């Protein structure tokens with residue numbers, strides 16, 4: 001089992017906090033990351049979202065997926081994962097503005113498609129794929145996770161969460177019927193491809209969030225693919241357009257995406 005014996009995990013510096021949890025850099029067989037899902041006695045919702053997140057993570061054993069290490073219920077509900085030196089893709093592209101070579105951008109894309117293909121084969125829909133959830137371990141290896149603390153685990157689009165730029169037209173329309181599919185994860189991956197190849201977030205010239213929501217959902221607005229840097233291969237721009245298709249069934253799945261990136265990478 002993955003239940004860590006009591007009084008083994010130690011917690012150090014607070015790395016983040018939100019409505020749905022607090023993350024610390026901790027110690028348990030070396031450096032680890034610890035997520036405290038509750039503070040006071042947990043609600044039945046918190047216990048269930050904990051059981052569901054642990055259920056998802058315990059099924060993952062892949063180099064491009066954040067390493068789940070274990071869990072604790074005493075004294076608080078905790079999830080222990082590996083600790084990674086580095087920064088997320090978001091930090092690199094939009095905060096410190098790292099100028100990666102085209103070969104590295106294609107490799108980050110390949111490693112993300114690699115981890116995504118794995119999750120989909122295990123019937124795990126990410127539901128929140130974006131550059132912030134793509135960690136660059138030692139600024140070289142992609143480690144996909146869900147580092148967000150604004151959202152809860154399980155169920156599917158209540159809403160209320162700013163990951164709108166990576167939302168497929170069918171997800172951004174905020175309908176009662178569950179809009180989440182493998183294809184909505186592919187659209188989010190297409191947005192990540194846009195960020196890699198442009199170095200920008202889409203719709204940067206629109207200052208109104210409700211207008212972005214309305215227009216993407218209605219198909220009036222889509223990413224400007226002419227913004228992709230000159231050295232972006234024609235196959236990559238073609239793949240990006242395929243992933244961003246408004247009709248979800250027209251979107252390629254990750255075994256196809258992965259084969260397209262692997263062929264692209266060999267032909268540089």
Ligand SMILES: Cc1ccc(NC(=O)c2ccnc(C(F)(F)F)c2)cc1-c1cc(OCCO)nc(N2CCOCC2)c1
Pocket residue numbers: 015016017023033034035053056057060065066079080081082083084085119124125126135144145146147148149153
């Ligand atoms: C500790 C923790 C526990 C569970 C989870 N859960 C998932 O990752 C998850 C949930 C649902 N599904 C999946 C899916 F991948 F299958 F989709 C994955 C995350 C963390 C966590 C939070 C976070 O946040 C930092 C503050 O934002 N930083 C990290 N780092 C680890 C690497 O070193 C830098 C710090 C780890």
